Design a protein around this ligand. Structure first.
Ligand SMILES: [Mg+2]
Ligand SMILES: [Mg+2]
Ligand SMILES: [Mg+2]
Ligand SMILES: [Mg+2]
Ligand SMILES: [Mg+2]
Ligand SMILES: [Mg+2]
Ligand SMILES: [Mg+2]
Ligand SMILES: [Mg+2]
Ligand SMILES: [Mg+2]
Ligand SMILES: [Mg+2]
Ligand SMILES: [Mg+2]
Ligand SMILES: [Mg+2]
Ligand SMILES: [Mg+2]
Ligand SMILES: [Mg+2]
Ligand SMILES: [Mg+2]
Ligand SMILES: [Mg+2]
Ligand SMILES: [Mg+2]
Ligand SMILES: [Mg+2]
Ligand SMILES: [Mg+2]
Ligand SMILES: [Mg+2]
Ligand SMILES: [Mg+2]
Ligand SMILES: [Mg+2]
Ligand SMILES: [Mg+2]
Ligand SMILES: [Mg+2]
Ligand SMILES: [Mg+2]
Ligand SMILES: [Mg+2]
Ligand SMILES: [Mg+2]
Ligand SMILES: [Mg+2]
Ligand SMILES: [Mg+2]
Ligand SMILES: [Mg+2]
Ligand SMILES: [Mg+2]
Ligand SMILES: [Mg+2]
Ligand SMILES: [Mg+2]
Ligand SMILES: [Mg+2]
Ligand SMILES: [Mg+2]
Ligand SMILES: [Mg+2]
Ligand SMILES: [Mg+2]
Ligand SMILES: [Mg+2]
Ligand SMILES: [Mg+2]
Ligand SMILES: [Mg+2]
Ligand SMILES: [Mg+2]
Ligand SMILES: [Mg+2]
Ligand SMILES: [Mg+2]
Ligand SMILES: [Mg+2]
Ligand SMILES: [Mg+2]
Ligand SMILES: [Mg+2]
Ligand SMILES: [Mg+2]
Ligand SMILES: [Mg+2]
Ligand SMILES: [Mg+2]
Ligand SMILES: [Mg+2]
Ligand SMILES: [Mg+2]
Ligand SMILES: [Mg+2]
Ligand SMILES: [Mg+2]
Ligand SMILES: [Mg+2]
Ligand SMILES: [Mg+2]
Ligand SMILES: [Mg+2]
Ligand SMILES: [Mg+2]
Ligand SMILES: [Mg+2]
Ligand SMILES: [Mg+2]
Ligand SMILES: [Mg+2]
Ligand SMILES: [Mg+2]
Ligand SMILES: [Mg+2]
Ligand SMILES: [Mg+2]
Ligand SMILES: [Mg+2]
Ligand SMILES: [Mg+2]
Ligand SMILES: [Mg+2]
Ligand SMILES: [Mg+2]
Ligand SMILES: [Mg+2]
Ligand SMILES: [Mg+2]
Ligand SMILES: [Mg+2]
Ligand SMILES: [Mg+2]
Ligand SMILES: [Mg+2]
Ligand SMILES: [Mg+2]
Ligand SMILES: [Mg+2]
Ligand SMILES: [Mg+2]
Ligand SMILES: [Mg+2]
Ligand SMILES: [Mg+2]
Ligand SMILES: [Mg+2]
Ligand SMILES: [Mg+2]
Ligand SMILES: [Mg+2]
Ligand SMILES: [Mg+2]
Ligand SMILES: [Mg+2]
Ligand SMILES: [Mg+2]
Ligand SMILES: [Mg+2]
Ligand SMILES: [Mg+2]
Ligand SMILES: [Mg+2]
Ligand SMILES: [Mg+2]
Ligand SMILES: [Mg+2]
Ligand SMILES: [Mg+2]
Ligand SMILES: [Mg+2]
Ligand SMILES: [Mg+2]
Ligand SMILES: [Mg+2]
Ligand SMILES: [Mg+2]
Ligand SMILES: [Mg+2]
Ligand SMILES: [Mg+2]
Ligand SMILES: [Mg+2]
Ligand SMILES: [Mg+2]
Ligand SMILES: [Mg+2]
Ligand SMILES: [Mg+2]
Ligand SMILES: [Mg+2]
Ligand SMILES: [Mg+2]
Ligand SMILES: [Mg+2]
Ligand SMILES: [Mg+2]
Ligand SMILES: [Mg+2]
Ligand SMILES: [Mg+2]
Ligand SMILES: [Mg+2]
Ligand SMILES: [Mg+2]
Ligand SMILES: [Mg+2]
Ligand SMILES: [Mg+2]
Ligand SMILES: [Mg+2]
Ligand SMILES: [Mg+2]
Ligand SMILES: [Mg+2]
Ligand SMILES: [Mg+2]
Ligand SMILES: [Mg+2]
Ligand SMILES: [Mg+2]
Ligand SMILES: [Mg+2]
Ligand SMILES: [Mg+2]
Ligand SMILES: [Mg+2]
Ligand SMILES: [Mg+2]
Ligand SMILES: [Mg+2]
Ligand SMILES: [Mg+2]
Ligand SMILES: [Mg+2]
Ligand SMILES: [Mg+2]
Ligand SMILES: [Mg+2]
Ligand SMILES: [Mg+2]
Ligand SMILES: [Mg+2]
Ligand SMILES: [Mg+2]
Ligand SMILES: [Mg+2]
Ligand SMILES: [Mg+2]
Ligand SMILES: [Mg+2]
Ligand SMILES: [Mg+2]
Ligand SMILES: [Mg+2]
Ligand SMILES: [Mg+2]
Ligand SMILES: [Mg+2]
Ligand SMILES: [Mg+2]
Ligand SMILES: [Mg+2]
Ligand SMILES: [Mg+2]
Ligand SMILES: [Mg+2]
Ligand SMILES: [Mg+2]
Ligand SMILES: [Mg+2]
Ligand SMILES: [Mg+2]
Ligand SMILES: [Mg+2]
Ligand SMILES: [Mg+2]
Ligand SMILES: [Mg+2]
Ligand SMILES: [Mg+2]
Ligand SMILES: [Mg+2]
Ligand SMILES: [Mg+2]
Ligand SMILES: [Mg+2]
Ligand SMILES: [Mg+2]
Ligand SMILES: [Mg+2]
Ligand SMILES: [Mg+2]
Ligand SMILES: [Mg+2]
Ligand SMILES: [Mg+2]
Ligand SMILES: [Mg+2]
Ligand SMILES: [Mg+2]
Ligand SMILES: [Mg+2]
Ligand SMILES: [Mg+2]
Ligand SMILES: [Mg+2]
Ligand SMILES: [Mg+2]
Ligand SMILES: [Mg+2]
Ligand SMILES: [Mg+2]
Ligand SMILES: [Mg+2]
Ligand SMILES: [Mg+2]
Ligand SMILES: [Mg+2]
Ligand SMILES: [Mg+2]
Ligand SMILES: [Mg+2]
Ligand SMILES: [Mg+2]
Ligand SMILES: [Mg+2]
Ligand SMILES: [Mg+2]
Ligand SMILES: [Mg+2]
Ligand SMILES: [Mg+2]
Ligand SMILES: [Mg+2]
Ligand SMILES: [Mg+2]
Ligand SMILES: [Mg+2]
Ligand SMILES: [Mg+2]
Ligand SMILES: [Mg+2]
Ligand SMILES: [Mg+2]
Ligand SMILES: [Mg+2]
Ligand SMILES: [Mg+2]
Ligand SMILES: [Mg+2]
Ligand SMILES: [Mg+2]
Ligand SMILES: [Mg+2]
Ligand SMILES: [Mg+2]
Ligand SMILES: [Mg+2]
Ligand SMILES: [Mg+2]
Ligand SMILES: [Mg+2]
Ligand SMILES: [Mg+2]
Ligand SMILES: [Mg+2]
Ligand SMILES: [Mg+2]
Ligand SMILES: [Mg+2]
Ligand SMILES: [Mg+2]
Ligand SMILES: [Mg+2]
Ligand SMILES: [Mg+2]
Ligand SMILES: [Mg+2]
Ligand SMILES: [Mg+2]
Ligand SMILES: [Mg+2]
Ligand SMILES: [Mg+2]
Ligand SMILES: [Mg+2]
Ligand SMILES: [Mg+2]
Ligand SMILES: [Mg+2]
Ligand SMILES: [Mg+2]
Ligand SMILES: [Mg+2]
Ligand SMILES: [Mg+2]
Ligand SMILES: [Mg+2]
Ligand SMILES: [Mg+2]
Ligand SMILES: [Mg+2]
Ligand SMILES: [Mg+2]
Ligand SMILES: [Mg+2]
Ligand SMILES: [Mg+2]
Ligand SMILES: [Mg+2]
Ligand SMILES: [Mg+2]
Ligand SMILES: [Mg+2]
Ligand SMILES: [Mg+2]
Ligand SMILES: [Mg+2]
Ligand SMILES: [Mg+2]
Ligand SMILES: [Mg+2]
Ligand SMILES: [Mg+2]
Ligand SMILES: [Mg+2]
Ligand SMILES: [Mg+2]
Ligand SMILES: [Mg+2]
Ligand SMILES: [Mg+2]
Ligand SMILES: [Mg+2]
Ligand SMILES: [Mg+2]
Ligand SMILES: [Mg+2]
Lengths: 275, 88
RNA sequence: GCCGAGGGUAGGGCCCGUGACUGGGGCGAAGUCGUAACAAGGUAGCUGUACCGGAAGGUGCGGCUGGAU
RNA sequence: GUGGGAGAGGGUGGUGGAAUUCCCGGAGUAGCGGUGAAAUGCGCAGAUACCGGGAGGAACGCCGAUGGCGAAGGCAGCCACCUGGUCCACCCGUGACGCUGAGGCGCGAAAGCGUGGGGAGCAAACCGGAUUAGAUACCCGGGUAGUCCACGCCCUAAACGAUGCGCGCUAGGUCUCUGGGUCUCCUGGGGGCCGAAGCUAACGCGUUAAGCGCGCCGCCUGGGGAGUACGGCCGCAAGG
RNA sequence: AGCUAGUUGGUGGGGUAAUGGCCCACCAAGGCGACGACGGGUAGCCGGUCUGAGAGGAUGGCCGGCCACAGGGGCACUGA
RNA sequence: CCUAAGGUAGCGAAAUUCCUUGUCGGGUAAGUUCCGACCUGCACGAAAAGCGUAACGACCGGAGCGCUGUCUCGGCGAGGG
RNA sequence: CCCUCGCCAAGGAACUCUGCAAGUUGGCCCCGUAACUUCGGGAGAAGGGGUGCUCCCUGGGGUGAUGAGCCCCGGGGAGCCGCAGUGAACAGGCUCUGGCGACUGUUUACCAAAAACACAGCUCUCUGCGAACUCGUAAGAGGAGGUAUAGGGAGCGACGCU
RNA sequence: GAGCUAGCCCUGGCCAGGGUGAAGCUGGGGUGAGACCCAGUGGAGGCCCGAACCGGUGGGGGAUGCAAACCCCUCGGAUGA
């Protein structure tokens, strides 16, 4: 669901908020949080190197388990579902029967009070983790690793899912969230199901201030600048671009491909994306 | 569905005299039974418009008897709809 | 002293007359353009809707026979 | 009530194969495609035609019927669950509890709209080729909404049987679907055809009345202007 | 298509030949409406007249009855 | 005849109209501005977005009531110079 | 003569590029309030009545104790005075109608606050993650302890119909 | 050279008083169940009025200034970007 407001202020009229119904615990688990070093988009030189960043809400970072092959065969109960400010997706607090506690990103359908497990033998049900080779071809999956033991890299954002297409030797064939068709190694762990909070994309920020809370400062158009600042700078009155639309740094910005052609992972991408 | 057994209890708890099936009492009670189930069926299957007509007919059906029953013995009317929890 | 005809201030409601200009409508006709309908009317017709075209109209979708053979 | 029946009736969730398209491997060569005839188009940068692999979407061939179901719109592979109407036999229960229905409320083909998916085929708009006096068309090659899914809107129709619902009475023949019997046939309930009496301006209707009658409702009052204007209510808009 | 604050009723008084929210004070939350309230338009109503086979339709001048008005409004005085 | 193709809806004397105080209408006793129209748009036009839009504005136009030393048209008075 | 201020007969914007400036209005309580509308608003729209003091009668609340006292919020009646009762001080002038920008915001420190910038929102496009992109010769960093419902770049700028 | 200024990072602090009255919740109505309507409760918001605080709209003065940007009147924001 998504919550609307009555138009009692001009900005409320459009603003929509998340429904937060799946949340059962309004406090992060202390032994799993640590402080987020805000950067402002500035690097170790101090330079802005990603423009327009800063001034958002303070955040405590939740330590997530992107391995899971860490604890094969030890089951865990789903103790709660929590809000995580560092992602789109929601999180799930697991209490292992081991006694150890961990977070994973919360799949859609997960129940508070159910059980999950990881390993070659896990039942193919929501929340379990297996090497890709043992998940049946055709079932949809998330939190997928890209190389074995390297951590879950793909399908991590709310509502996303990858899907297994077929197999070819040591490798399985995934259709990624973007529609790209890729070979991933069969020993790459993955978690059955899709990520939850799929209603995320229907959120209407509603006013300038909301973006500000998110730590996103205002973006200024090239066309509004001067030639020193930007290719689109200057001109008397408004002006069309007057050259191929360009970035602040001059490269072409409508259409121009930038993936390195000789990149070694090319042997593994079957079909570049779509749409 | 409703089962034979499940239905008899209703027939048995509302019968006016030992052998009774289908007196106004039992009639309404039997109807209240299928109604309340269909209501729950439509609660999930919101797009089953055809079976809603059924419901509206039954709701209509039970309504006309209650008017009959309320007309002949008021004391008995309020008695049946209390045991069935019906007015609104 | 109250009420009080009415006068005055302010804001509302219904109606009537009228208005540069504008929308289609009726009639007039000895005008221009095409030929959509009535025969299978020369792409069967009509239809609600949608998009389009100088104009009758066309085409998509679904519907009707009030369609020749 | 008890006991049975037939059915594409409705909702949810799955799942099967035929075919079209695209992609991949093979093998193969100079054309393929299309029309009235053609051109556009595609093709030696290897098409068509053929074999194997794969991806995805939509619609269900034969059965299929002058058939079945639904109040209407409408509903067709198959599987399970949930659910509605309806017929039959027994003559067991209630005892006129009935009929209709201004407002109201719900349902309501297609197209259309909103947010999000999906997009193989088809295809308004649009482009190109032909035809032609012209061709903003008919024919051919392309092609976007949309057609599909979810939720929410719109509420219109040649939404038709151009025939409001219920009840009773008034010859029969025949074909068919579906219950029940004493299974030639008898009896119910639906679907067609021809016909008694009667009705009708005629065409035609005729136990599925458009016949003879009662009840209640909706509707008509010369053609156009006009389903327009104004007012009013509804809708995001279209517009009702 | 909804209307109503003297509004609807009660009590106490004022007022008249006399009842009455007719008028005033207080008290209660009521009164009217699809059997068409409220609003807009039009008209004085009837005996009758005209037409019509009747049912009905149209009408209300003259004449008789009642009402309303007396330049437009408001008010009282004298008085059975 | 020419083109790769010849501006669609909507809007238009406009923050855009040169001729220009275009023409007509409204408002005024009188209106180069303002509002409503017309269209031969010098030189609008569809995300350098097009046409609208309730609310908002120390933005920029036009009008009216109220009230005033803004003005007719100036006068006197106070205080600091 | 100047500045700051006070008042002014009759007129009342005739001033001027412009009502510039200055009048007016001004708090609370009560009555009342239009087009249009995204149904919130427009709205303090507008317009108007009240406002001091004295006496008599009475209602609820707090702290007490359930009462006195103290404090809070009222109601009704009859009277007094002045030109005048938010008697001083602080305290909106209003309305109709176009353009531009949806809106709150931001800006040329010190001649421009705007119609400019930003803005939610729309679209195109890049990026499979040792991402693209950015800074750095490099190492290392940001991106991001994020992962296509995510991140960069660009144009447009609520919303409606396009 | 970032003791001015601009952005960010870490850690503290501040915003009188009044007004409007979102969702939610409770009760009542409505219905087959609903949608929903009403009342109370409630206290939302780049909400409203206005001090501090942050500004700098118009006008006047100042102009070898009180001041190398000030003064007066007026005006914008004031729980938020
Ligand atoms: Mg949810
Ligand atoms: Mg909202
Ligand atoms: Mg709300
Ligand atoms: Mg809401
Ligand atoms: Mg508002
Ligand atoms: Mg708004
Ligand atoms: Mg969220
Ligand atoms: Mg959120
Ligand atoms: Mg949630
Ligand atoms: Mg710690
Ligand atoms: Mg960190
Ligand atoms: Mg460092
Ligand atoms: Mg350094
Ligand atoms: Mg950057
Ligand atoms: Mg930054
Ligand atoms: Mg979260
Ligand atoms: Mg968004
Ligand atoms: Mg944040
Ligand atoms: Mg952004
Ligand atoms: Mg910008
Ligand atoms: Mg600019
Ligand atoms: Mg500039
Ligand atoms: Mg520079
Ligand atoms: Mg340079
Ligand atoms: Mg440059
Ligand atoms: Mg430029
Ligand atoms: Mg410049
Ligand atoms: Mg420029
Ligand atoms: Mg210039
Ligand atoms: Mg510029
Ligand atoms: Mg220019
Ligand atoms: Mg510019
Ligand atoms: Mg421009
Ligand atoms: Mg330029
Ligand atoms: Mg350009
Ligand atoms: Mg240029
Ligand atoms: Mg150029
Ligand atoms: Mg890799
Ligand atoms: Mg029944
Ligand atoms: Mg009843
Ligand atoms: Mg009076
Ligand atoms: Mg008067
Ligand atoms: Mg007088
Ligand atoms: Mg006219
Ligand atoms: Mg005319
Ligand atoms: Mg005319
Ligand atoms: Mg013809
Ligand atoms: Mg034809
Ligand atoms: Mg034709
Ligand atoms: Mg059509
Ligand atoms: Mg033409
Ligand atoms: Mg066409
Ligand atoms: Mg039909
Ligand atoms: Mg091949
Ligand atoms: Mg060759
Ligand atoms: Mg093949
Ligand atoms: Mg049938
Ligand atoms: Mg019997
Ligand atoms: Mg009805
Ligand atoms: Mg429909
Ligand atoms: Mg449709
Ligand atoms: Mg459209
Ligand atoms: Mg759609
Ligand atoms: Mg779409
Ligand atoms: Mg063509
Ligand atoms: Mg041609
Ligand atoms: Mg053509
Ligand atoms: Mg074609
Ligand atoms: Mg569309
Ligand atoms: Mg559609
Ligand atoms: Mg038919
Ligand atoms: Mg029929
Ligand atoms: Mg009809
Ligand atoms: Mg007819
Ligand atoms: Mg009827
Ligand atoms: Mg009839
Ligand atoms: Mg039989
Ligand atoms: Mg049988
Ligand atoms: Mg039969
Ligand atoms: Mg049939
Ligand atoms: Mg016949
Ligand atoms: Mg005969
Ligand atoms: Mg027969
Ligand atoms: Mg007839
Ligand atoms: Mg006539
Ligand atoms: Mg007529
Ligand atoms: Mg209409
Ligand atoms: Mg119509
Ligand atoms: Mg209208
Ligand atoms: Mg009275
Ligand atoms: Mg009184
Ligand atoms: Mg009159
Ligand atoms: Mg009269
Ligand atoms: Mg006659
Ligand atoms: Mg008369
Ligand atoms: Mg007369
Ligand atoms: Mg007389
Ligand atoms: Mg009189
Ligand atoms: Mg006279
Ligand atoms: Mg007189
Ligand atoms: Mg008189
Ligand atoms: Mg006398
Ligand atoms: Mg070309
Ligand atoms: Mg013009
Ligand atoms: Mg002019
Ligand atoms: Mg203009
Ligand atoms: Mg204009
Ligand atoms: Mg111009
Ligand atoms: Mg000019
Ligand atoms: Mg000029
Ligand atoms: Mg002149
Ligand atoms: Mg002139
Ligand atoms: Mg004039
Ligand atoms: Mg003037
Ligand atoms: Mg004039
Ligand atoms: Mg003039
Ligand atoms: Mg002017
Ligand atoms: Mg000017
Ligand atoms: Mg004009
Ligand atoms: Mg001209
Ligand atoms: Mg322009
Ligand atoms: Mg630009
Ligand atoms: Mg452009
Ligand atoms: Mg713009
Ligand atoms: Mg405009
Ligand atoms: Mg605009
Ligand atoms: Mg506006
Ligand atoms: Mg503003
Ligand atoms: Mg402003
Ligand atoms: Mg004045
Ligand atoms: Mg003077
Ligand atoms: Mg002097
Ligand atoms: Mg003096
Ligand atoms: Mg002096
Ligand atoms: Mg002096
Ligand atoms: Mg004076
Ligand atoms: Mg005077
Ligand atoms: Mg004046
Ligand atoms: Mg005056
Ligand atoms: Mg002058
Ligand atoms: Mg002025
Ligand atoms: Mg001023
Ligand atoms: Mg003053
Ligand atoms: Mg004051
Ligand atoms: Mg003032
Ligand atoms: Mg008005
Ligand atoms: Mg409103
Ligand atoms: Mg206004
Ligand atoms: Mg006031
Ligand atoms: Mg106003
Ligand atoms: Mg006042
Ligand atoms: Mg005193
Ligand atoms: Mg205390
Ligand atoms: Mg006390
Ligand atoms: Mg006052
Ligand atoms: Mg005084
Ligand atoms: Mg003072
Ligand atoms: Mg003073
Ligand atoms: Mg004020
Ligand atoms: Mg003023
Ligand atoms: Mg106005
Ligand atoms: Mg203005
Ligand atoms: Mg102008
Ligand atoms: Mg504008
Ligand atoms: Mg601006
Ligand atoms: Mg602005
Ligand atoms: Mg706007
Ligand atoms: Mg803004
Ligand atoms: Mg603000
Ligand atoms: Mg404000
Ligand atoms: Mg502002
Ligand atoms: Mg601004
Ligand atoms: Mg400067
Ligand atoms: Mg400045
Ligand atoms: Mg400077
Ligand atoms: Mg400077
Ligand atoms: Mg400067
Ligand atoms: Mg200055
Ligand atoms: Mg400035
Ligand atoms: Mg400003
Ligand atoms: Mg300034
Ligand atoms: Mg700026
Ligand atoms: Mg801007
Ligand atoms: Mg937009
Ligand atoms: Mg979107
Ligand atoms: Mg560099
Ligand atoms: Mg470098
Ligand atoms: Mg590093
Ligand atoms: Mg790194
Ligand atoms: Mg990091
Ligand atoms: Mg990321
Ligand atoms: Mg904007
Ligand atoms: Mg902007
Ligand atoms: Mg712009
Ligand atoms: Mg609108
Ligand atoms: Mg600093
Ligand atoms: Mg500093
Ligand atoms: Mg801190
Ligand atoms: Mg504050
Ligand atoms: Mg405050
Ligand atoms: Mg406060
Ligand atoms: Mg609560
Ligand atoms: Mg409730
Ligand atoms: Mg409430
Ligand atoms: Mg309160
Ligand atoms: Mg508040
Ligand atoms: Mg604020
Ligand atoms: Mg505020
Ligand atoms: Mg405020
Ligand atoms: Mg302080
Ligand atoms: Mg400061
Ligand atoms: Mg500043
Ligand atoms: Mg200043
Ligand atoms: Mg001033
Ligand atoms: Mg100055
Ligand atoms: Mg100054
Ligand atoms: Mg200076
Ligand atoms: Mg000051
Ligand atoms: Mg102030
Ligand atoms: Mg202030
Ligand atoms: Mg304020
Ligand atoms: Mg505030
Ligand atoms: Mg805060
Ligand atoms: Mg903040």
């Amino acid at each position: 669901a998504v919550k609307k407001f009555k138009p009692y202020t001009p900005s409320r009229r459009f603003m929509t908020v998340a429904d937060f119904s799946e949340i059962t615990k309004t406090e992060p688990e202390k032994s799993l949080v640590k402080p987020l070093k805000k950067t402002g988009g500035r690097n170790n030189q101090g330079r802005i190197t990603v423009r327009f960043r800063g001034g958002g809400h303070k955040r405590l970072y939740r330590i997530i388990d992107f391995k899971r092959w860490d604890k094969v065969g030890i089951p865990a109960k789903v103790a709660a579902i929590e809000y995580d400010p560092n992602r789109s997706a929601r999180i799930a607090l697991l209490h292992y029967v081991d006694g150890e506690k961990r977070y994973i990103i919360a799949p859609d359908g997960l129940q508070v009070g159910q059980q999950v497990v990881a390993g070659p033998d896990a039942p193919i049900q929501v929340g379990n983790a297996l090497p890709l080779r043992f998940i049946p071809v055709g079932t949809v999956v998330h939190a997928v690793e890209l190389e074995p033991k390297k951590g879950a890299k793909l399908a991590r954002a709310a509502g996303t899912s990858a899907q297994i297409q077929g197999r070819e030797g040591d490798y399985v064939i995934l259709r990624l969230p973007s529609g790209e068709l890729r070979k991933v190694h069969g020993e790459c762990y993955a978690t059955v199901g899709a990520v939850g909070n799929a209603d995320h994309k229907n959120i209407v920020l509603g006013k300038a201030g909301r973006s500000r809370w998110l730590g996103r400062r205002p973006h200024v158009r090239g066309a509004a600048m001067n030639p020193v600042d930007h290719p689109h700078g200057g001109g008397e009155g408004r002006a069309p671009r007057g050259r191929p639309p360009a970035s602040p740094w001059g490269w072409q910005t409508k259409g121009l491909k930038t993936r390195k052609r000789r990149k070694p992972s090319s042997r593994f991408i079957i079909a570049r994306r779509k749409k | 569905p409703i089962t034979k057994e499940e239905k008899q209890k209703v027939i048995q708890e509302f019968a006016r005299f030992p052998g009774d099936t289908g007196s106004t009492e039992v009639q309404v009670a039997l109807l209240t039974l299928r109604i309340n189930r269909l209501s729950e069926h439509l609660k999930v299957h919101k797009k089953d418009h055809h079976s809603h007509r059924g419901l509206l007919m039954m709701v209509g059906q039970r309504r006309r008897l209650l008017r009959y029953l309320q007309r002949e013995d008021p004391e008995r009317y309020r008695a049946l709809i209390e045991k069935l929890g019906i007015r609104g």
